[PDB]
Amino acid sequence: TETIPDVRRLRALQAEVHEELTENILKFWATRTPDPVHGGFVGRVGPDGRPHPEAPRGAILNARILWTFAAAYRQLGTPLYREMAERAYRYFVRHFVDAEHGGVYWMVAADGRPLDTRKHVYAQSFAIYALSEWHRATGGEAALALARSIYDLIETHCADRVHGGYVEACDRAWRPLEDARLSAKDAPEPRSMNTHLHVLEAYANLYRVWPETELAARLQALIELFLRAIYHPATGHLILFFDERWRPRSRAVSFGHDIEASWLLLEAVDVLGQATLRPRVQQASLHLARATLAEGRAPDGSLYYEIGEQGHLDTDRHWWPQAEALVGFLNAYQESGEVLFYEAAEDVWRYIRERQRDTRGGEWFARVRDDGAPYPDDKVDFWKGPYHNGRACLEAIQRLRHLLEHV
Ligand SMILES: [Cl-]
């Protein structure tokens, strides 16, 4: 009694996603961004497509490059992707990893000198995520050892054992900082959904390759924290910021984070095999997906950016909520069998192809205005890597593969 798109549509979508990933996204990243002056990858590519090999380089961006090429190599086998992942890994271990205090710096100069040595848990998480993926792709001993060491440092220096969750930022020597903001956009609050979501993402990937008993407990605790404190059943949205006891300190809504968490939370419970927790997670996941469907979309099926603290709807289409909606809506279809979620995934894909991707300049525009005008944002910067859209394509390809095997 399944309602399933026919084989032609499934395969056509899967082929388009594969083409987008390999002939647009990963081609852009492998050709435009490697830096032969300092090694590794440039920190910025302007709106005109010009790379900036002297720009400062973010740990999150470089972890995202490593993760994406590692994952693409694992799933597709293309040798260039292993080469690019190795390139990212080598620069990462050389320069971003703090050999003295452990963990990864926030920002290095292009030549590798530390510039911002804070140890932000969000960056530590992306390091774990990328290093565990590189281990998954290669069996790399050192990659896994490094991921485990960063996990240990997060638990040792940042875990709030009274209230759950984590202090989100420390200085180089792991002393907590008051200002845990990722950027000026973020509320000056001690706890954020965003950082905790990516701890969960990292821990789930680490557990997949290293099923340590204590890590399972920490990951389950994070799932339970989302269910009890962050997910808001009255509205179907994640609460974004909190004090240390998880009292809400924001009313903003992030549609992209809702739909990302919708599928990441289920990936996390399934990595654990926690069948007892899964019904509650699936319920919250489907709720987040329905709330996104009903409240976060433009009539073309693309996702708006946010409802701000004053209630203003930011109608800009940022690139990464569209990517996360592609995966999250496909995932919601897989979980519920409700083909309306597949229709929604198809609609966001069509928007990605017709508006968000930059056919002339390559990759995807960071932002498209409500009237269709692409903003002249950088194509690559501290916050724009290949991970959201690369992962989204890889996820969709594999999910469509599974759906194709239902026949
Ligand atoms: Cl990204």
Burial-class residue 350 by CB neighbours within 10 Å (0-12, 13-18, 19+): middle
Tell me whether residue 3 is in a domain: no
CA of 382 from ligand 1 middle (Å) equals 9
CA of 247 from ligand 1 middle (Å) equals 29
CA of 65 from ligand 1 middle (Å) equals 8
CB atoms near residue 281 (< 10 Å)? 22
Q: Phi and psi at residue 101, in whole multiples of 5°?
A: -105, -10
**Count: domains in the chain:** 1
What's the token pair of residue 94?
A: 């050389």
Buried/exposed 141-178: b ≥16 CB within 10 Å, e otherwise: eebbebbbebbebbeebbeeeeebbbbbbbebebeeee
**Beta strands 114-116; 107-108: pairing state:** antiparallel
d(CA 193, CA 7): 38
What's the token pair of residue 255?
A: 């549609």
Of the candidates 11, 4, 57, the residue with the CA atom closest to the CA atom of residue 34: 57
The CATH number of the domain holding residue 84 is 1.50.10.10
CA of 2 from ligand 1 middle (Å) equals 34
CA of 243 from ligand 1 middle (Å) equals 28
Domain hosting residue 322, numbered range: 8-404
CA of 7 from ligand 1 middle (Å) equals 31
Catalogue the long-range contacts made by 174-180 (C-beta closer than 8 Å, 24 or more residues apart): 174/101, 174/102, 174/103, 174/119, 177/118, 180/120
Cα distances (Å, whole numbers) of residue 156 to 39, 169, 174: 33, 13, 9
CA of 163 from ligand 1 middle (Å) equals 30
Burial-class residue 224 by CB neighbours within 10 Å (0-12, 13-18, 19+): middle
Q: Give the technique used to solve this structure.
A: X-ray
CA of 384 from ligand 1 middle (Å) equals 5
Cα–Cα–Cα angle for 192, 391, 142, nearest 5°?
85
Query: In which residue are the tokens 């470089």 written?
Result: 62
Contact 168, 158 (CB under 8 A): yes
CA of 320 from ligand 1 middle (Å) equals 7
Tell me whether residue 172 is in a domain: yes
CA of 162 from ligand 1 middle (Å) equals 33
CA of 87 from ligand 1 middle (Å) equals 18
Query: Largest Cα–Cα distance in the chain?
Result: 60
Tell me whether residue 330 is in a domain: yes
Three-state SS letters, the chain: CCCCCCHHHHHHHHHHHHHHHHHHHHHHHHHHCECCCCCCECCCECCCCCECCCCCEEHHHHHHHHHHHHHHHHHHCCHHHHHHHHHHHHHHHHHHECCCCCCECCEECCCCCEEECCEEHHHHHHHHHHHHHHHHHHCCHHHHHHHHHHHHHHHHHHECCCCCCECCEECCCCCECCCCCCCCCCCCCCEEHHHHHHHHHHHHHHHHHCCCHHHHHHHHHHHHHHHHHHEECCCCEECCEECCCCCECCCCECHHHHHHHHHHHHHHHHHHCCCCCHHHHHHHHHHHHHHHHHHCECCCCCECCEECCCCCEECCEEHHHHHHHHHHHHHHHHHHCCCHHHHHHHHHHHHHHHHHECCCCCCECCEECCCCCECCCCCEECCECCHHHHHHHHHHHHHHHHHHCCC
d(CA 93, CA 224): 33
CA of 57 from ligand 1 middle (Å) equals 14
CA of 27 from ligand 1 middle (Å) equals 15
CA of 380 from ligand 1 middle (Å) equals 9
CA of 372 from ligand 1 middle (Å) equals 22
Three-state SS letters, 106-152: CEECCCCCEEECCEEHHHHHHHHHHHHHHHHHHCCHHHHHHHHHHHH
Helix axis angle, 340-351 to 319-336, nearest 10° = 160
CA of 161 from ligand 1 middle (Å) equals 31
CB atoms near residue 274 (< 10 Å)? 16
Helix axis angle, 387-404 to 319-336, nearest 10° = 20
CA of 279 from ligand 1 middle (Å) equals 30
CA of 211 from ligand 1 middle (Å) equals 27
CA of 157 from ligand 1 middle (Å) equals 27
Of the candidates 295, 322, 305, the residue with the CA atom closest to the CA atom of residue 391: 322
Contact 40, 53 (CB under 8 A): no
CA of 272 from ligand 1 middle (Å) equals 26
Q: How far apart are the first and last CA of the chain?
A: 13
